[PDB]
């Protein structure tokens, strides 16, 4: 057995960086929740929880400075939660065959109980997760037609052919658009009082 003390370790160990606090707080916050993740006996690793990871950092991490270690950071903290940094980014990149596909025709490949990689990820997921909801929202986003717009109405239709617990889908995301629109919020903040120190110090 591991601890979030060792697990915080082991980040704080291969980053041996400063964290730079404008996202320090989701940072602790995904590295704690997947590690209450990995930890649980009924966890399972699957490109659905791939996918949700990388776009959860993808998104989370917007504008982070300096740029070149926001991949150093998803580099340490993968195996600090004993996951692979590589094996990660390319089960989430391995979903972009499902580029343009129709909401029709992904449900035809669920209900004729032959889905193909990594769509059969709905399946077997294992331990629920508020990342396995972002995974399937970043898969529902390069669908044709726009289907995360109107997401609850998308949602209650995978409702019978998904195992997944669309109730706690829907409000885990919409914590999730929640909390992505308050660093955005912040992020722009930034922008606007970095040019505060940068055009006054100079001026
Ligand atoms: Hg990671």
Redesign the pocket.
Known sequence: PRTVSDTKRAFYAAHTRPIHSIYRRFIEELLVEIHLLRVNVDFRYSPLFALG?VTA?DQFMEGYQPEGDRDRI?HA??VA?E?N?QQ?KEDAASWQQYQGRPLSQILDELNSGQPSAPLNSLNHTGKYSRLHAVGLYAFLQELAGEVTIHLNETLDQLAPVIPLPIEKVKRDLELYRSNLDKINQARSLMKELVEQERKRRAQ
């Open positions: 990871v950092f998803f903290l993968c939660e996951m940094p990660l």
